[PDB]
Amino acid sequence: SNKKTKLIHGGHTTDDYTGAVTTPIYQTSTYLQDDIGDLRQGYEYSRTANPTRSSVESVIATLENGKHGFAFSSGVAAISAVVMLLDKGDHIILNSDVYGGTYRALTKVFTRFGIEVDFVDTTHTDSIVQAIRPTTKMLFIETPSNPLLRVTDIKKSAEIAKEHGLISVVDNTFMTPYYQNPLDLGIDIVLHSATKYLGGHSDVVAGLVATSDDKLAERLAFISNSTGGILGPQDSYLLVRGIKTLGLRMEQINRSVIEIIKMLQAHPAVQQVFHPSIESHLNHDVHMAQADGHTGVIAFEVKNTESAKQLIKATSYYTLAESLGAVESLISVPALMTHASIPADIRAKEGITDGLVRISVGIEDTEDLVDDLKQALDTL
Amino acid sequence: SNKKTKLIHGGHTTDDYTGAVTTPIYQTSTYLQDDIGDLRQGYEYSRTANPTRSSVESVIATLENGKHGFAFSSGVAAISAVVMLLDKGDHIILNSDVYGGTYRALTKVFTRFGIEVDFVDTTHTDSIVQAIRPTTKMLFIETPSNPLLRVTDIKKSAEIAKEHGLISVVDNTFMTPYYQNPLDLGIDIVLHSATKYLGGHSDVVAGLVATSDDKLAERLAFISNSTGGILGPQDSYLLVRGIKTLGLRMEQINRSVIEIIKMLQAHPAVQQVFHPSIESHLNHDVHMAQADGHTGVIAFEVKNTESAKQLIKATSYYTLAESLGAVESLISVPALMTHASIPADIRAKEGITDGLVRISVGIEDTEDLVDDLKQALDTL
Amino acid sequence: SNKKTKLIHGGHTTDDYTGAVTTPIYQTSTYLQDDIGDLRQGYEYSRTANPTRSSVESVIATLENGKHGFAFSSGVAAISAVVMLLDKGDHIILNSDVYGGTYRALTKVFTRFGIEVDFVDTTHTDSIVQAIRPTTKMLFIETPSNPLLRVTDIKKSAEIAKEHGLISVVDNTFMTPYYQNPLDLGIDIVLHSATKYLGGHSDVVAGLVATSDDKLAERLAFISNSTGGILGPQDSYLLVRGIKTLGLRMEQINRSVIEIIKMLQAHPAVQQVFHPSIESHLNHDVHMAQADGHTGVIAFEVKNTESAKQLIKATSYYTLAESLGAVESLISVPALMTHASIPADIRAKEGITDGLVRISVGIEDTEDLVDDLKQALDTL
Amino acid sequence: SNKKTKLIHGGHTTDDYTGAVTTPIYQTSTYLQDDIGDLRQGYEYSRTANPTRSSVESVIATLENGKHGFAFSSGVAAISAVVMLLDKGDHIILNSDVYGGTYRALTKVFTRFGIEVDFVDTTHTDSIVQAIRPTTKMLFIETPSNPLLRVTDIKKSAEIAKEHGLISVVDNTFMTPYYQNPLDLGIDIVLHSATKYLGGHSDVVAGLVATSDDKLAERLAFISNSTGGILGPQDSYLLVRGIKTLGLRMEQINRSVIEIIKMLQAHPAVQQVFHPSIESHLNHDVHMAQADGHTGVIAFEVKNTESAKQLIKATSYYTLAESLGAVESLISVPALMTHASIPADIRAKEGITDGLVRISVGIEDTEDLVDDLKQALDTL
Ligand SMILES: *Cc1c(COP(=O)(O)O)cnc(C)c1O
Ligand SMILES: *Cc1c(COP(=O)(O)O)cnc(C)c1O
Ligand SMILES: *Cc1c(COP(=O)(O)O)cnc(C)c1O
Ligand SMILES: *Cc1c(COP(=O)(O)O)cnc(C)c1O
Ligand code: NA
Numbered sequence A, B, C, D: 001s002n003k004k005t006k007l008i009h010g011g012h013t014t015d016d017y018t019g020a021v022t023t024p025i026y027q028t029s030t031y032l033q034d035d036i037g038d039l040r041q042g043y044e045y046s047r048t049a050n051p052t053r054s055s056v057e058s059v060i061a062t063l064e065n066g067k068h069g070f071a072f073s074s075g076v077a078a079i080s081a082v083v084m085l086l087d088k089g090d091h092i093i094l095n096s097d098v099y100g101g102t103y104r105a106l107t108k109v110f111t112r113f114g115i116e117v118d119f120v121d122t123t124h125t126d127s128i129v130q131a132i133r134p135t136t137k138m139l140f141i142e143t144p145s146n147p148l149l150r151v152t153d154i155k156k157s158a159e160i161a162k163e164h165g166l167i168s169v170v171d172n173t174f175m176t177p178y179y180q181n182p183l184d185l186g187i188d189i190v191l192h193s194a195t196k197y198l199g200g201h202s203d204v205v206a207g208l209v210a211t212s213d214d215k216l217a218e219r220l221a222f223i224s225n226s227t228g229g230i231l232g233p234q235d236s237y238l239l240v241r242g243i244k245t246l247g248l249r250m251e252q253i254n255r256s257v258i259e260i261i262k263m264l265q266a267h268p269a270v271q272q273v274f275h276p277s278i279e280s281h282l283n284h285d286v287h288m289a290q291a292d293g294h295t296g297v298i299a300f301e302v303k304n305t306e307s308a309k310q311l312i313k314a315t316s317y318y319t320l321a322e323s324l325g326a327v328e329s330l331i332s333v334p335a336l337m338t339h340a341s342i343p344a345d346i347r348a349k350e351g352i353t354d355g356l357v358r359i360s361v362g363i364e365d366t367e368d369l370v371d372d373l374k375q376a377l378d379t380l
């Protein structure tokens, strides 16, 4: 019914056989057949299907109001499976600032296979309409994006994609199914790095894909069985487990995000703050129209590299590590950690200043996180 | 020193920190950094590297006398990573009868990306030399093959590939590193479905790749990090564990294989038997030159479909399931289970008769397995 | 600092070696020694200590403001370890209505070893003072208790125990360290069935013990190493993981508990309601003095057995199963499931009527849980 | 049929529901009930029973030709459960040189509960008959024992126990069910530290108990459910897995043991060698009558402490660690590691000289292990 209930009771996450209230971990590769071709419960080889992976697929299908779910060994494995729906000569439109691993896969792997790619600022959807070529097959958007949290209108992207015969894809990692459901907005395929909020405990690398489209689902299933980037049963189980607390975690994170943003906007050592909840943020109205909460990723500007490093060292509760969506609050400097390969002046032009800090808000106490960052900002 | 010792002490499979005599299971996704860019032990994100996966990679590199190892979420994920070394327009030569999942990936996925593929009978290596096009980049061989155990000369394939500038790849699943080491024979890349003998307990779906080539290793690492078909830590641990008993298991299996083949050749209800140990087998001398033992996969002909099904039902210790390399002995009918999509007359032409039976010998008692199959054959 | 922060950053739950932000799972039994007796990090045999178990012990010590932690294979293993601090002829005072497994262990196992036991209504602490014999060594209390949630004054029990030289023990399962810390109130030893709220996901059977007493800790360590009821590394890891969300879960549960109690008190098909938050509840003031929140266990009276069974069948979000502290809301009938062995008239005398229902509130949406139970109560 | 077959197909280690050829890992604590008291498959709470633990219990019952199996969190947890069959005032006869953890539990824990214990040299069974008191309830023997491998006649111990109404128990760790089956010889209860050979990979701490006695089984079940020293599902699964290779491992170990003993007896730096295969060993005939193979534990005398330490440092394939039954060969000095608490002169009197070395033979190559130890012995 309501979301926190659906998180607990949605999907199949009990054992029909023994009644176990948690999904059994089928650490197995093959299955007995009573007669050639007669499978007791549909299973014959774990690559093709595994009952624990099936459980987590069922969960992500349910939570995104889709019909079919797919678990891959990582977010980029999910993304590659989706891109492999295309053929050489086909063309993809993506938002200009996609995740660096997505960019790296597309421009360094799939263009070698004849996939054509254009990166486009989708904060104006007419920019998509201009980018459409006769060969364009796919529209792939993240919203909001990293690390500047640019918002793209999901419903209009869906309409554009429908009118031009495009497979529409949304990378919904930053919002999770708890706050944003692209399938409800006409999108064909939604995916996630479950490594982030869904697993939620920094202990699983996984990707999840959902669709309501039977034919796209058949093609994704064939790709996943042929290229084999499948999530194992232990990790599927840990995903199912971590998703149970997703609503509580996201809501704690959102409370903290509101307070932290008030603090950041007030503080003199902080310049621009990037987050879709700020009403002056580009496409704020759009985000509130397609989502009923916020991501825990915030970026803000301190003065320079040394200010940023001092910030990191002076916090007690912000941890320096890769990834986002942990229980811990994480802190990073994109210009040094994710965009250090881009030349400095291009970084500056794009907004990736040396003092740009990205925090991923965790589930620590709101007051502690506000106070800790402030006292660290006070030391500049 | 000797192989059973190297299986126990080869690779890094203890914890340097605590002294744990088994590899810790790093069920983790990210790692603390003491300063931006300073990684305590080289780890920063589990997709890129994970210490348990690193352990199993170290093992497969050691066992194949390579320098670099790679663990993927399945055998076909390893194969796809290797194929993604190529670009559109490049061409691959494979043995005509490759594993059906390899064939399916190549002809249904990678040709859509402009990879050109020719399937060629490599039991005569000059057939490779004829198939070489100006665009040919890769030579990929299984030996022995499924389900008829056709043998390909690995060292000559390596020489051909060297002389023509081809990346040479051997799928070494059926023999394991215990009996056959393609890298020692000049091959550039060796891979395995670790789902089969290496894991050895029917409880892990995994692939493993080894190379001594620094530049090929860099490209494989980049592909694996960008497309993300990585083996998880729990499965890496179970692989490391199962590999410990590989020598003992393979040797039990080989003893059983010798006895079972004597029985099969003697029995009147059995016609042709396919296995490289039979001296009349094509390229028997070649196999004995490149290997010092045998695969546990045998195929043999009974009269028809009903004979085969009666065989399956009458055995007590042969289990009907997919996969091979279990502790259990497995039995299957290719014509119904792996080649049922091919038209019947093509099946017949290729040797896949309705009565062709494939067994994968397990580690049960030799006498029990010989006697059980015989009494089942006696009921025809 | 504040509790939700301490839950994330309290204890040692990262890897010092690799920087892994989660505790590695040391699925290992023994450890290399560089020289006889020189242990790299203190480990020599997993029964005696295991680094994953050490992590969870560190967590429970931190969360209870103790100094030493101990993980056992179940709550009753923890309880038995504590009771084995005593010698034959020694005497224990417990609250009259202890958990049935505690009662069963004490009266059916440990009295056969000469441990003397008296069950006493500790809601009046002077009742403890009367029960003190010259042989009395231990005072063991649960608060609040099952299934009627009787409250015992922890601080006065601590004072009594100090003055009479008793080892004081509190079973703190129902409240968790998040709401009640008996060690801060003078108690010598606190324990938990971590099977319930701490693990919190119905997927671990475990016990946890904490103390600040060095000498009691030495004796508990010796007992645990000699009788061997140790929690394994995988379960220790899952405990550490589940404890991260304990504050969020308990707080969601508490919000639901307040609303559900308002509903129950209003409903005509419900008679008495048992929960320490009700101001007419015996020792309500005491509970609010020793705790800053509430357990999720509520009991209430419907009319009879058939009413109770109809309730169970008519709910959509209350699940019929054993245990408490799940993410799911659980429902049970003590008179049939936990006290069916007691004669009916004794049941009635004790308050365990046929229509006594026990719910353990989960983390589903508050409104859904209130509405679901009401509409089920409406069908009576 | 034959033992290696029974190891693979004995017990229930597949999933009836999905056909999974390996036991699912029920990482769960509780089970749904369709109606109050109606359990779908007999499960209601994992402490009481868990389907993965049930699988391993089934295996150990099968392998010991018993009827009931029990998995505990460690060998000493199994031993304590068995001892808790007794009441205060009851008396136990054990062999004089029992495992130090058994001795420590009995004399430091259970005597505090009024259990009386006598340690007796059972290599002459009439020594048991003399030790029998009117209060004697249990006869507990290890054979062969640690570290001097003293052999006790199991069948005569069974007869004595029957005639005097004693519960007879054999700790069968060192021999495993593969070579010695005390239940077939009249013994009431057999147990194991599965930490050693059965798990076989140094990655599980576990105990296993088997019996054919329905009433003893009821009492063991009640004890295990009340005191709660249960083996978790992940460890139960790893036990089931490791037991598959037990025959192959034990047989490799036995081949190595024969060769290593020839070498040791020949070498001039080695004095006495203790192992039941040596024909001059006390009760050699008895051992060959009750077993059809050998333990992998050997002890032998070098000259002194410095010789022993030089031996340890000079080997390449003998690892210094606690425990036995690994895949690795392990080496230890009892006088320093397991008997360092006993005064020196008592050590000497008992045979625990400073130069007494204990090796546990692993599954490395036989020649490597013989040669490695010899060249290390050559450096003295
Ligand atoms: C309430 C509920 C739903 C409803 O899903 P919506 O499409 O969001 O209304 C789905 N699944 C479960 C298990 C529920 O309890
Ligand atoms: C003996 C030994 C080797 C030797 O490897 P080969 O190339 O086959 O000679 C390698 N690693 C370990 C651990 C060994 O013990
Ligand atoms: C704040 C904090 C504490 C403080 O504990 P209290 O005794 O409750 O004040 C302890 N540990 C950590 C990690 C903390 O962050
Ligand atoms: C052969 C066989 C047995 C026979 O057991 P024994 O008592 O040793 O003869 C038992 N179980 C299985 C599965 C077997 O295959
Ligand atoms: Na459900």
Ligand code: NA
Binding pocket: A186, A187, A188, A212
């Ligand atoms: Na649609």
Ligand code: NA
Binding pocket: B008, B009, B010, B011, B012, B013, B014
């Ligand atoms: Na090693």
Ligand code: NA
Binding pocket: B186, B187, B188, B212
């Ligand atoms: Na080479």
Ligand code: NA
Binding pocket: C008, C009, C010, C011, C012, C013, C014
């Ligand atoms: Na910490």
Ligand code: NA
Binding pocket: C186, C187, C188, C212
């Ligand atoms: Na105190």
Ligand code: NA
Binding pocket: D008, D009, D010, D011, D012, D013, D014
């Ligand atoms: Na079986």
Ligand code: NA
Binding pocket: D186, D187, D188, D212
């Ligand atoms: Na008997």
